[PDB]
């Protein structure tokens, strides 16, 4: 039975000529209940998804046909679930994915009729798909429009919501051993990556180690080590803007029945029949992601405490279990920079302890408030105009680096370390940084499209130059050598080309002129300052899953609150 358009139509008018649709019901029941037939069915003249949509349009108006579809999907699903696992077919048949892109066109998947037993079974059968098949399917889905991605999103959001509402989840019955929610979210991962795909880079350098480096010399792992629990369905395909906003995947009914105390366990030690809902972190709320990061960064503190206990045991050494600063209140930068420099030199992995920062001249037990006080003191004194490190756009109330700040490289490293320690041990600050800062931290340079946050008064001028329909060569005569004036009154004419002051702008050169001017404004003017800033930020949170759990858009929420 090689179904096509013509077989379905011929059976359809044969049914309506006898005024009874029993042949269509029996055909649809016996063909859509077999995995072998749909793989060879509906092939192009290797599958005509538009023609499947046409068949569904011309067919799904009858209730008997659609309930036959439901029961046939119920029959189809478990014999494919126990086929990808106990056997393997996609390796010997690339056509097998046809099965999963003919039943997905069913508009009644996004309906309560398929919610109870059809869709859980189908998403369980699809959850065990091999990684290459998942990559091909995500690549296929990425070309779909926004409404179809929203439909595939809500198809599994409905199932997760229904299976969370309908199932009572105490601490003894978790969401990790409920295969319906696990399969639905592991199939929603495909829709999330299809949204990512269908919707400029930094130069990272890591930090060394003192004693473990000699061990790395011993084992021979000295060239370059690897780091990151990064997902399996990546490096099969490709940071960018999505087709549907990333907040839409945040499943709120699931996020209030999770247990990150137990979920972090299955994230750091991989139990077989227990899914860890940070492998799919896009369904994690802000409080849930922050909770998981908090558990990770407290387990690291306990590991460093145990390391110092061992050093107390064998060698007899006495080591401080905290990052015990001692800053005089009259000089916070001058007395925190030197301590952080000393600790960064002698023991680079000592900044991954609990921060204890007490002031001289006063005795305080650090229950958390004293570290907080140190933090607003730092944010006050770093961001003041007297130190001359950050300028303050009052039209947007945003703090952006100074292109004319020199010999403060250590202090930019200090504020980077302040943000790193802030994220590390659960501290919230008041930093008014543009989002280009929170992306340039993660490893992505800033594009002209994000000059609207940092410098809006100049971004508007650049955009008005971009779509200016008249000839730009004879109207403003702006050269490639830009005209920027320092706060000192001196000009700081910067060069974007070898003959910038001799090459006039043209109606074609403006497109790259804008994207070199933006590059100079927010990548090259502040290159030393941000290099120091990002090194300071990285040296505290280099072993953290923050690049894995937290998107750049949801890190301003982590520091600023």
């Amino acid at each position: 039975t090689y179904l096509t358009e013509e077989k379905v139509y011929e059976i359809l008018e044969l049914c309506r000529e006898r005024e009874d649709y029993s042949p269509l019901i029996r055909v649809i029941g016996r063909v859509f209940s077999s995995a072998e037939a749909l793989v060879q069915s509906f092939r192009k003249v290797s599958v005509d998804i538009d023609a499947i949509r046409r068949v569904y349009t011309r067919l799904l108006s009858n209730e008997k046909i659609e309930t036959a579809f439901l029961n046939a999907l119920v029959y189809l699903s478990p014999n494919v679930e126990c086929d990808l696992t106990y056997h393997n077919v996609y390796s010997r048949d690339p056509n097998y994915l046809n099965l999963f892109i003919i039943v997905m066109e069913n508009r009644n998947l996004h309906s309560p009729e398929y919610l109870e037993m059809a869709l859980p079974l189908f998403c369980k059968a699809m959850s065990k798909l091999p990684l290459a098949a998942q990559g091909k399917l995500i690549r296929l889905w990425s070309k779909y429009n926004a409404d179809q991605i929203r439909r595939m999103m809500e198809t599994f959001q409905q199932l997760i919501t229904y299976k969370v509402i309908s199932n009572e989840f105490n601490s003894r019955n978790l969401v990790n051993d409920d295969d319906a929610i696990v399969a639905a979210s592991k199939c929603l991962k495909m829709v999330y990556y299809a949204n990512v795909v269908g919707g400029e880079e930094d130069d990272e350098e890591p930090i060394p180690e003192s004693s473990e480096l000699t061990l790395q010399e011993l084992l021979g792992e000295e060239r370059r080590n690897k780091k990151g629990p990064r997902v399996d369905p990546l490096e099969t395909e490709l940071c960018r803007k999505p087709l549907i906003p990333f907040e839409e995947f945040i499943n709120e009914p699931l996020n209030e029945v999770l247990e990150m105390d137990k979920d972090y366990t299955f994230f750091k030690v991989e139990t077989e029949n227990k899914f860890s809902f940070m492998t799919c972190p896009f369904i994690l709320n802000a409080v849930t992601k922050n909770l998981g990061l908090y558990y990770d960064n407290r387990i690291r503190m306990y590991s460093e405490r145990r390391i110092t206990v061992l050093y107390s045991l064998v060698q007899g050494q006495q080591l401080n279990p905290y990052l015990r600063l001692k800053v005089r209140r009259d000089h916070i930068i001058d007395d925190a920079l030197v301590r952080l420099e000393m600790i960064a030199m002698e023991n680079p992995a000592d900044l991954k302890k609990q921060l204890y920062v007490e002031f001289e001249g006063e005795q305080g037990v650090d229950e958390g408030g004293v570290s907080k006080e140190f933090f607003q003191l730092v944010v006050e004194e770093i961001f003041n105009p007297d130190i001359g490190m950050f300028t303050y756009d009052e039209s947007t109330k945003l703090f952006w680096f100074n292109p004319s700040s020199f010999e403060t490289e250590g202090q930019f490293t200090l504020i980077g370390i302040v943000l790193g320690l802030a994220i590390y041990n659960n501290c919230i600050l008041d930093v008014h940084f543009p989002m280009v800062v929170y992306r340039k931290l993660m490893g992505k340079k800033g594009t002209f499209r994000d000059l609207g946050d940092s410098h809006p008064v100049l971004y508007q001028s650049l955009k008005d130059l971009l779509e200016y329909e008249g000839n730009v060569e004879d109207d403003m005569m702006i050269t490639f050598q830009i005209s920027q004036t320092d706060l000192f009154g001196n000009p700081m004419m910067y060069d974007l080309k070898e003959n910038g002051d001799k090459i006039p702008i043209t109606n074609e050169n403006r497109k790259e002129f804008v994207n070199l001017y933006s590059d100079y404004i927010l990548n090259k003017s502040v290159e030393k300052q941000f290099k120091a800033f990002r090194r300071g930020f990285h040296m505290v949170t280099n072993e953290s899953p923050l690049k894995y759990l937290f998107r750049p858009e949801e890190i301003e929420l982590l520091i600023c609150g």
Partner: protein, 140 residues
Amino acid sequence: MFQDPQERPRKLPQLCTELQTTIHDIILECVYCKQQLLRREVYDFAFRDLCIVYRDGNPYAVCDKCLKFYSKISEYRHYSYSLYGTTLEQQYNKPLSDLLIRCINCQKPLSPEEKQRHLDKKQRFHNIRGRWTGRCMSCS
């Protein structure tokens, strides 16, 4: 003696043959505690496939105590996640006999009977500092 950067013997038997000696007639200094190593310690350093560490042109071994101690320190400090043997096989697209998995306390590479003992007993291989480690039967 071996102050040349790109001329020096990396492991113990190469060090023995370029020093006109044997593995039975060598005295070696631990790179951590700067103490001499006994016969069983240079034998274990040979069996564990550990590189000779060169400081100021002098070749250095590691005794048992410093090896186990700093391996434990690095286990605490740089642990990433524990994966199953079957998960490792399906992830790396290679059998466990084609992957380098060292012991987690003594850094002896695992013979395939030890990896099969991990697979049969449903134990996990731990990622420490980007390298996979298990547990040999000597340390289990």
